[PDB]
């Protein structure tokens, strides 16, 4: 339940990934892993806090959230140790030449649904939910990462702190776009997800047709969401009925991750799996 | 958020358990726990048991729905499960498969996982308490109300089998259940699944039973005729250790047993 302190030798560690300076390392016993590297420069402080936060992150163990295996923390480079995906993110599996069927995609959003009701179970907002911090194993599970580190203040500032060697915007709810200092709340992550479903029916990033960012902005805040004709696919009403519900303007009239595993599990089960 | 207060005029019409039919939510299982004389003195009580109750809120245990708070009636009202509780299942007509009894399992890791993860000991994990929907899907109950002292004597004034209990708790009723009581009950389970009946069927009486169980009896193993992955046999022996320290946490179970389920079973 503390955190493996892990060392450099230990590794074989790769070059970078396009899907990250993350890389692919290969530990000397317990295998292939995935490694992110947040720090590397001279000697610098917050040592105690970043393995405190490091121990805070190991804390939240579920089936459908990335686990952190250990932490690399010595003179002057610091990196997160995580379990291995083969598969990459879930905007890297949609776009492969390979056909996802409804029932998998189906899977998917019910394994998303219970992974983001166990996070918001311990009180935590994830405040960057989006297809690249969804990661997809060989059996094509899915499990919940922040690659960002939205919610470990001390690690995502080390990555810009000082002397350091080494997207978000189509899945950010409108009450966050253009804030400099906006508060995310739980409803936030709901906006998210209503964008991946629609994400995951499309196999496409939305808003194709922008031409510059202040457009995107104020076409979303003014109300603007993906365009539901352009799933050439089948996609269930039920599902395009979710999205919209999940996309709403008011925060409050969007539903809670329970509210919609209550109606989408029976749902998957009955018409999708 | 809070507890849904129900009328029993919203309805058609272990305990007096009565499958009965909301108006506009539709059909539900109802438990009467009280009928006869008025005790409104205490009703505050048994209300915030009721949101002690309803704040447990996952895929794999019962929902409370609401409760019934009346002038000498007293319900709790839950979500129903076509196929009644997982012995009865085991003991149907119907074989039911290796791979099934794995989701079986993995389910329960899963519900048992969420109410720790809530601070909650069961304390009285069984087969009874394990109910199933039409597609074997699993969820736990507290139909003894066990974690629920006030519902609990109501229950059973006026108008529970030792098989699955730790052998901390045999005679000694005023040792504290720990995360581990309910890991012990768990493992006497996992042989119920592969058995298809309860154990120790060849008991001379049930003090001199206790008293084996106390010094190291567990559950028959050949007992177990048809096919049982040795994992789970291992499983199922480092579940029911005599030392509580020595099981393992759900979490524990969970990042073994998933994988293993996944590769093997699935
Ligand atoms: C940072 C790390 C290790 C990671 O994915 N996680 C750490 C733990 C589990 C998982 C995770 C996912 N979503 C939100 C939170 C929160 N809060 C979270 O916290 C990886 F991205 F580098
Ligand atoms: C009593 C009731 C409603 C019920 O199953 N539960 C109430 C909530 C969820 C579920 C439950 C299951 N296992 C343990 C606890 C605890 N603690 C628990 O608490 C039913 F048996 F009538």
Redesign the pocket.
């Known amino acids: 339940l503390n955190v493996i302190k892990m060392k450099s030798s230990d590794f074989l560690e790769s070059a970078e990934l396009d899907s990250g300076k993350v890389s692919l390392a290969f530990h000397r016993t317990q295998g292939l892993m995935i490694m992110?590297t947040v720090y590397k420069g001279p000697n610098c402080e917050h040592n105690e806090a970043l393995l405190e936060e490091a121990k805070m992150?190991?804390r939240?163990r579920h089936s459908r959230?990335?686990?952190?295996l250990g932490v690399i923390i010595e003179e002057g480079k610091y990196s997160?140790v995580?379990e291995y995906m083969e598969k990459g993110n879930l905007m890297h599996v949609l776009k492969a030449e390979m056909s996802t069927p409804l029932s998998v995609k189906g899977r998917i959003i019910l394994e998303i649904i219970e992974g983001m009701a166990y996070?918001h179970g311990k009180g935590?907002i994830?405040k960057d939910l989006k297809p690249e911090?969804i990661l997809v194993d060989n059996d094509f599970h899915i499990k919940?990462?922040?690659?960002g580190?939205?919610?470990?203040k001390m690690?995502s500032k080390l990555n810009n702190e000082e002397h350091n060697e080494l997207g978000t915007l189509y899945y950010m709810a409108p009450e966050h776009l253009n804030d400099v200092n906006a508060k995310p709340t739980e409803k936030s992550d709901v906006y998210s997800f209503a964008v991946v479903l629609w994400a995951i029916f499309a196999n496409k990033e939305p808003y194709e047709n922008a031409i510059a960012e202040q457009q995107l902005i104020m076409a979303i805040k003014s109300g603007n969401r993906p365009d539901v004709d352009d799933i050439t696919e089948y996609c269930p009403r039920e599902i395009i009925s979710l999205m919209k519900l999940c996309w709403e303007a008011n925060p409050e009239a969007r539903p809670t991750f329970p509210g919609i595993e209550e109606k989408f599990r029976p749902f998957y089960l009955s018409q999708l799996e």
């Open positions: 992110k992150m190991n939240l959230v990335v686990k952190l997160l995580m996070l935590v994830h911090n919940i990462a922040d690659l580190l939205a919610s470990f690690w």
